[PDB]
Structure 1
Amino acid sequence: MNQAIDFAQASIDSYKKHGILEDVIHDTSFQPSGILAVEYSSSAPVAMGNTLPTEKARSKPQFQFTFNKQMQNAYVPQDDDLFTLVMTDPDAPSKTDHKWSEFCHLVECDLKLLNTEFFASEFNTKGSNTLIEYMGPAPPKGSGPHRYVFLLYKQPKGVDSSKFSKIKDRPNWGYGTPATGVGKWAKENNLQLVASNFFYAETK
């Protein structure tokens, strides 16, 4: 129960132990500004590393962002703010074979929040733009478990998704080279990482 006090430290510890900071985010100094609650159904929540049966992650999940001015360059919530929600697998086709490392599962942009500082809010899906429609986990039988990582980014003020670099296709996020994805794409588009959650799925 000692470890359930600081949700920030708890998040960092998880990202570290599961190589999310090095394999995906590529930043070991990353500090979450809030926490991203993601759920497929009341029985299928993505809770920082739990395992979910593939069939449950079949449709697009719901999201919620909880900001806590304390878990903290720094992200200061505002009204103009537009966000980008990403879902990627850095273990494609497996945790070892990275011929397709970083398989693009989802990319939603121009998302706005319905909304001492603290607040939990869901997103307003209305005026958003999906660059890459959602596709649930589909790991190759026998490849072992895969990491399915959700990442929330804050877009630069005033710039909509029509200005972000294109995404050829899913494998390698269309970059050709192995082990490349959200990290590469997020940087060339000046996106600011704000939160992340993840789960495991496997096909036996």
Structure 2
Amino acid sequence: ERLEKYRSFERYRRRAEQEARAPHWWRTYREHFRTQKLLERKHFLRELRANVEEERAARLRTASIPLEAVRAEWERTCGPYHKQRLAEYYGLYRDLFHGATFVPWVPLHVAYAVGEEDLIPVYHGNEVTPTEASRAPEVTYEADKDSLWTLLFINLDGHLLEPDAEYVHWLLTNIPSNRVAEGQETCPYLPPFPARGSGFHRFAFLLFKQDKPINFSEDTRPSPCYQLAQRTFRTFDFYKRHQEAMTPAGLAFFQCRWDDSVTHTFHQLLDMREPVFEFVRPPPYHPKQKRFPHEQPLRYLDRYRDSHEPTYGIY
């Protein structure tokens, strides 16, 4: 009686949801399943509050916000952290580095040019058709002077023979500062080739800070190379060999399905018959037959038959 009682449904709901998050003794569903910036920040706010026009629009409920300005500011402040969530959510950190997690810090930007009028961007989790990815994409990531780089683009789940391995698409090395044309093309650019009926493949862009120029002669690949046995590649072991001078700083990944252009890639240059896959569900469970299916309909016999066509044996 001393404690007050929730006077509204929402109060209980907010209490309940917060209550659910906390761990409990009893089994539950979840178990099984700087200062100067502050001062400057405040000062800008006060100016915004003073503006009468801001008040009038708000009370007239006609105000609006510029999305582009927020996006750029969001990138500076906490974009690294949100990007990390997507990478963990999409499984990049577990499939790439065997569970190691790195916060992206370089605001990497990639877009696939469609003709010349417009260019398709590649954000985190975006959808880009293989036709759109036929040619290599423009990359601008605001390196600043010096600080050599290496750009690595790979499809994590596109391998056709070994599950763990993945296929390199193009690898640029010794990229000095912003300019990317000055990079050694160890791996030539290949169009994405996701098999038909194989679901959505996730392709990611990886940028590594380079302390000192290192010749990646082992990772150099002949240009052009159309052999999948040579495109097989593990990010995890590769980063081990270069972890001294390679530290990741950028991310960008997109999802793509199969497409008619994929048919061209499998035949024209890969020079192999294209693989076709289908989603197969497991056979339905039926209890073991009984010689006498007592109290069962006539359909019982059809459940355990394989061929729908009559047979005659000796006749």
C-alpha distance 172-12 of structure 1, shift in aligned 2 (>3 A): farther
Answering whether residue 234 of structure 2 is matched by residue 181 of structure 1, we say: yes
| 5+ residue gaps, structure 2 | 1-66, 260-315
C-alpha distance 142-131 of structure 1, shift in aligned 2 (>3 A): same
Which of the two has greater helix per residue?
2
Match of 1:8 in 2: 80
Distance in 2, matches of 1:45 and 1:29, equals 25
C-alpha distance 28-106 of structure 1, shift in aligned 2 (>3 A): same
Paired residue for 2:139, among 26, 47, 63?
63
Q: Report the structure number with the largest CA radius of gyration.
A: 2
**Which string of whole-angstrom CA distances, capped at 9 and with x for unpartnered residues, describes residues 35-55 of structure 1?**
211100234211100111110
**Secondary structure class of the residue paired with 2:176:** strand
C-alpha distance 203-31 of structure 1, shift in aligned 2 (>3 A): same
Query: Matched residues, percent identical?
Result: 22
Distance in 2, matches of 1:173 and 1:195, equals 25
Answering whether residue 117 of structure 2 is matched by residue 51 of structure 1, we say: no
Distance in 1, matches of 2:151 and 2:85, equals 22
C-alpha distance 30-49 of structure 1, shift in aligned 2 (>3 A): same
Q: Displacement of 1:8 after TM fit?
A: 1.3
| 5+ residue gaps, structure 1 | 68-76, 114-122
C-alpha distance 150-126 of structure 1, shift in aligned 2 (>3 A): closer
Paired residue for 2:195, among 134, 140, 143?
140
Instruction: Give the AA of the match of 1:84.
Output: T
**Secondary structure class of the residue paired with 1:110:** strand
**Which string of whole-angstrom CA distances, capped at 9 and with x for unpartnered residues, describes residues 59-83 of structure 1?**
000112147xxxxxxxxx7x44111
Q: Displacement of 1:166 after TM fit?
A: 3.0
Which of the two has greater strand per residue?
1
Equivalent residues of 1:165, 1:189 under 8 A apart = no
**Cα-Cα RMSD:** 2.8
C-alpha distance 99-13 of structure 1, shift in aligned 2 (>3 A): closer
Paired residue for 2:219, among 158, 166, 182?
166
**TM-score calculated relative to the size of structure 1:** 0.74
**Which string of whole-angstrom CA distances, capped at 9 and with x for unpartnered residues, describes residues 87-115 of structure 1?**
01110237xx74473111010011122xx
Distance in 2, matches of 1:189 and 1:112, equals 17
**TM-score calculated relative to the size of structure 2:** 0.50
Match of 2:258 in 1: 203
Paired residue for 2:166, among 99, 102, 107?
102
Equivalent residues of 2:167, 2:231 under 8 A apart = no
Distance in 2, matches of 1:135 and 1:146, equals 15
Instruction: Give the AA of the match of 2:188.
Output: E
* Number of residue pairs aligned between Structure 1 and Structure 2: 176
Instruction: Give the AA of the match of 1:58.
Output: S
Answering whether residue 98 of structure 2 is matched by residue 26 of structure 1, we say: yes
- 1:62-81 aligned at under 5 Å gives the runs 62-66=138-142, 79-81=145-147
Answering whether residue 153 of structure 2 is matched by residue 87 of structure 1, we say: yes
Q: Displacement of 1:29 after TM fit?
A: 3.2
Distance in 1, matches of 2:142 and 2:146, equals 18
